[PDB]
Amino acid sequence: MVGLTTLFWLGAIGMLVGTLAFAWAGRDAGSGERRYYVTLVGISGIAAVAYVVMALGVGWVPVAERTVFAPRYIDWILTTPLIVYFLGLLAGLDSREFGIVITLNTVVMLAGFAGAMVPGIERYALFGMGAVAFLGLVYYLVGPMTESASQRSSGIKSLYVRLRNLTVILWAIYPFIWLLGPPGVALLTPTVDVALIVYLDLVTKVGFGFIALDAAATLRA
């Protein structure tokens, strides 16, 4: 009475509802305002695609005693750079340090995927790398990008601190799911792990975009 099928299906339909909402909110386009909405729809659409392909049965990989949901790692590697792109859009980021942002993000994500695919205690060193790299990204989110967003309008600064807060808080939970779950000390049953990551993805993407929509509407009604 849980169904690992049904958690993936619920995540998929939630991401699709978010996709539809973010796309319909992009009807009245703008100068650059359109690209925020296309970023939101791309994020939630790739998320929905990954969740639908996982809901069938693909990607359930046997890596020594455990199951590796590789399609959700594909999802992460493809959709987290879109989120940091949105945050750079808000804060008014450069281009090279923007590349530093996205490269560090991809370092974390690649380390996580590889570590999920390694069967020995070797993988933890891999995980360690991501941790290190993560602590870089966080700083860039709270230091350089925040200082960049400081030289901006009131509403955009408020929206940036809201989104960067949610990101910095909830992204730091994924490593504990990786460690306390199948990829490490399998203390969380696959159902609990899957449900936790589904909820995390659902909020950190769709609720992220909902907050962004609301902020934009309020600031320039």
């Binding site: 009475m1 849980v2 989104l163 939970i173 049953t189 936790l196 907050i211």
Partner: protein, 66 residues
């Protein structure tokens, strides 16, 4: 417009907390049906860790939204 605290975020975290509680209690009953106590024990520690993680998620959400 919702409640001062947005009559959506608290009701939302509450409904999804009780949904996760249903998930965990279902796992607990399923593992107990086997009669093996070491199966429930596992399901219970995983439910406890997951509810602590859910505490973290809900608190992050309420800290960012307010």
């Amino acid at each position: 417009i919702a409640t001062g605290k947005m009559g959506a975020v608290f009701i939302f975290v509450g409904a999804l907390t009780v949904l996760f509680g249903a998930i965990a209690y279902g796992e607990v009953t399923a593992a107990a049906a086997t009669g093996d106590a070491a199966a429930v024990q596992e399901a219970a520690v995983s439910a406890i860790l997951g509810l602590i993680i859910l505490l973290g998620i809900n608190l992050g959400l309420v800290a960012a939204t307010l």
